[model samples]
Target chain A: PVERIVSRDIARGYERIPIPCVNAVDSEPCPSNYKYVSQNCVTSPMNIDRNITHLQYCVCIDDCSSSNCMCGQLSMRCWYDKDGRLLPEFNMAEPPLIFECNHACSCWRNCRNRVVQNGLRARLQLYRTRDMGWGVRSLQDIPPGTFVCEYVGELISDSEADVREEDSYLFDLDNKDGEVYCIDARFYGNVSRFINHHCEPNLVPVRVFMAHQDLRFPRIAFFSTRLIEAGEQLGFDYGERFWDIKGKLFSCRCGSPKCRHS
Target chain B: VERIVSRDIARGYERIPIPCVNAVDSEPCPSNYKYVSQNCVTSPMNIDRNITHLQYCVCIDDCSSSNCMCGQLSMRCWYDKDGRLLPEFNMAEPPLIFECNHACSCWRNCRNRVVQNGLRARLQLYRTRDMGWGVRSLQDIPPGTFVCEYVGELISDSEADVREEDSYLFDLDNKGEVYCIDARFYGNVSRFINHHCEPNLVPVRVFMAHQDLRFPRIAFFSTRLIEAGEQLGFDYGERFWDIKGKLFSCRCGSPKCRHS
Candidate 1:
């Protein structure tokens, strides 16, 4: 007889911030092979993700707002609303900036200055998809500007990615001095790595700054710009630039009015 | 030293990079000095860790407007509704500011917490050809913006009495204590700010963690729109000139320059 613990936490004592649960609907296999990390970890020796020695800790009260507040002023406007979700009115034509008060801040962890740094709030799950290999879906109804999850991976130098698989989860962080760096998730991947791509997508990539004053290597947090109903597959627009850089093309299963099936 | 490529003189102390260099001396490469973000207590000076500051706090999510007790403590909130200071705030009578601290339930984004956040505006400390070492803004600093503090060692006033008005010492006068901040070795970029008879930067006393009015922290605020690449200066008053200010001809090329 097969038995399970009363607490059906899918991470199997791994996730600390938000305990992810297994979808009771189907027998979903957990990715226990890879280690689960709550925050950014450095690959020693060649630390592409160096330690952030100094952090701009904010002194704003309640939720940080645009104007006056240092945390909110970083982006010229507060990223979140009263509900602690990304403001719906935020321009989402491209990957935007999201600044949350870093851990160094004296503010409470739940202060509105945070959205992505708070970790997974929505009920997300890994499941079998119709077309894409393995896809993520939500089991809860979410509001507009909801922070889903950020792309978790290794912070590796661009030189390290040369040996990596062609289309693997190699998320590159924009850098300065022409110093190229990326986050390779395959060796150490998380829930966000499995997120597929779609033309008309619900998710977005927001460059988050939590006292990491340097703009070069911002952590990418995928936020949903619109309300997402339960049981819907969550994905973001992995633009042609990604493929164009690789100089390769692929068919997309996301059917929409102006779907770029490349 | 000289920092032509924009090196962070703050080391790892400050939240952001406070880069300084001599754009002469490709900015000289190095001025032998210790970098600090805030004031640290040194020998002879002691912190009692007591709650001496006024504890008139309010239980609000965001402490703004006049309802905030810290606002009332400062007579009136120095900042506007948008969290910036009044453009015409009297420089002659700069009001003492009190900020929301850890004890208050209000979040960190409280409006009264401008100076507590520390460095925001992108500033550079370059060796001026005329004024030795001075600070300039890399960004357009809005009026009334709370710039970084004039940080140094919080030494006892007795240290000041013996040291002979140091080039880096600023007296901490709260109408009570005899204390002075010595920035000879351990200091932030504020130590490099040049003095002008007519200045753009206005020094204001602000309280953060503790409210011991005697030991209030000193913060600099811009009086008007400080344009990008504009030099930032403070009034040294008639007193400092007798000491370090008179050593050199005032090179602050202001039309209202008092170069007696």
Candidate 2:
């Protein structure tokens, strides 16, 4: 006898935003065992940990808008504009080596280069997509080049990642080191990890540098590909390697005009 | 290093604001609910809202004297001069509290009147790994900081049981004439807090408006250092399970949890 099970958890007053969940599909209970986090948590001993007592930072009084500002000088041109939107000249096919002002910088959080580091400003909703499993959507419309969210989870090393590659949730870090890190979101992650994949994705993964200029561990962040509307799902391509790998079977469900093979 | 402080997940649906935070899945908010700050008298029941009126404290101080009427009746004043709870305050079976009420001759900021003041630390309502909804303090709450009071509609226990949906029902511990609080239809954010085997918040019976043994308000105070973003809860007692029927599926995940 089903005998109507009351979740009892929902008898409260209200729910706050920033991360709101709802079962828009049906009355069936939805469960996910992992805890939500915004950035990488180093939970593994094998993961690299270096004591950073100090990191070289620029002292810019302005918003690092000047070309001479050391922080914005990493790339040929400033990656973002005055309003913090990514420049039209930025290449989505190959995201630039983006750098932002650090905590040591005199510039405040409202600076041009600090979009990804300032945390999420857009209203995001966690819900079940009709075709996909659980996914994230924007409550408000957004623009191209807008920093959506960071790929957060347990940060593991190449050694630990090697043992965990059987799980499909390992995201490789863009680093120059012979030994690198991977974000394992199978257990813990933010909404960014749940944002499913697409053949011609409307979002692109980029490497953002802040705080320490460690080439081996740049912050893996997401940016919108084009002007997006509200209620649309944010997606990114998991790459051909994700599809071409043997023994893995997945019919591409991006349903795009330029759809890749199953 | 904290990343996000927490947002107002309640979106003003609560009387005094509480947030809902879920990073695991899109599990936020309950269905068909309203907000209430304190318990409301349902059906104007002077019938069972009855309790013996105790003598008021005489000292002009915030009931600082050891001879305060409430203390003489119960354990004693548990507040430090700074308005925080003292270290020696008892939690062993637990002690009934009678805070300096409006009828008393003390300042509104009386150290003895913490619960009547309001919440000290702002709390965020986060979705527990599996417990549906749970309270998480936004600050490092030291021991005995009054978090909030569990309040709802005040009615007779007979009428409380008569109601169809009684999941949010809380029978007053002192049993003032068999009155109970039903928070299912309307309640504060604390109504959704799930049960735990070894919980952080300690429930203490309180009386501020009147000295009624049967009608003492239930206030939740932290027993230990409840760090920022740590889930706050208390054991719902074995009765919560005994009446829950044989469908046993408790997801508190406590190390000492007796139920699976």
Candidate 3:
């Protein structure tokens, strides 16, 4: 259960996703349910852990307008099943979801998941798709095939995933072809609400679901689509087969490394 | 906050009591919990920790039958006025409490609290006691007062302590009083075991809580009971009394020592 593996969220290779919001604020208070801050919304590369399924959350603060505008870093344990396998491991990619949620709502509040009958549902109370939005990340030109970073989500069953995909249908109106999965705590009011994409990304994103040791056993698996680069936003291919139900669709603008158009 | 003051549980400590049942022949898998075999219960003192609020569960098997056991321990973090942390911390002198919910249940219905609450909470459970079971000196006690040892909870809180003290006729029932409060994991099955006061019901021991943050704030309380060798036996006064509450009567029946 203690042994662990670390990799980027993008596909093919690795590119680091810098959590820009970590050092944004000086002082903060603890939230009601948690002994610490409400959420840590900064991205980072290192995911050191004692358990196999711990997750890290990082945020990037672009505007710094709200009083709670503090870039943060935090971690949580994972408790979901991939198929029949229970994943009680920790993931180091937690902060980005908080960052995304914070960027969208421009607020700091509780952001964990709520349990329904079948699975937990993730709520997105905020959306910051445009680069000019609050809590946005600042970066230079990102090259394709460059690994920007990773994304994370609490575990969900296929049925819950379908319902959640439908709930965010309006937000994904423009980018409807792209897939959408809950990358934040199973909580729906997360900052990672809107991080749309361009065809040719700087980093290749992937889903690395490591089998945590909560179920009958412990293990992990990581996979990716293509390569990504610097300054490019990271996104997951929920699967071209179900892209429309996933989220929204957008035009291609990437030309750096592994551009689909090139 | 980082600085804190340790406080005794504001309640009186009680002795663990059990109502014995002869259901040893039962082999049914506990529907709500699991049965911990006496042999498999580990007693390793995991004293190496950075946090002062952790408690460790150990088996306290006296020279009597191994079936007669108690489990669970209690620990607490003393915080300052602003809810800041305090460093001068001490776990119960003699590790109290037991995880014997199912360890000796007639119904075998005890849940293992330590494994469920993670390792941190496992070390935080303790109990509070007001009277002495007896007086015994640690063969290797430090020159100054220090933790002789600690014990794990072998009984449940709701029904563990003596509901009535036959020795004295008092209106209040002295049940559920233990020196160390078991803030650790808990179960309901370990609630009905008996307590024998020979050399058998000894409390296990732990050195100290987090060493890094607690060296200065916690002063060692006396470890030895000041009673005679042959009385019905009471526990050490330190388990239930601070400096101000150490003034009480001892009924130990030793010829050399006089009961104050």
- Give TM per candidate: 0.50, 0.49, 0.27
Q: Write the per-residue lDDT of candidate 3 for residues A24-127, one digit (tens) a residue.
A: 23222211121111111211111212231132222323322223433222112222222212132323233112121221122222222101111211111111
Cα distance off (Å), candidate 3, residue A68:
49
Model 1, A1-262: lDDT tens digits are 2322223443432344334433333454655555444355445333222232345666664545536667777676776776877665788886456677764453544566766655676777676554766677888898888888878766767787787666457777774468777777765556887788878889988888764556667888888878889989888877665657643545666666787664
Ranking by lDDT: 1, 2, 3
Task: Supply the DockQ value of model 3.
Answer: 0.02
Candidate 3 lDDT, B1-260, residue by residue in tens? 11111111111011111111112232222222221111011122222232213333323332122333232232331223322123343333332223222112211112222221111100011121333112232132321222212212222233325423222111111234322222122122121111222222223322222321211111122323323222112233333333324565543333443333
| Model 1 chain B poorest ten-residue lDDT run | B45-54
Candidate 1 deviation (Cα RMSD): 17.8
Best by lDDT: 1
DockQ, each predicted model: 0.01, 0.01, 0.02
lDDT of 1 at A85: 74
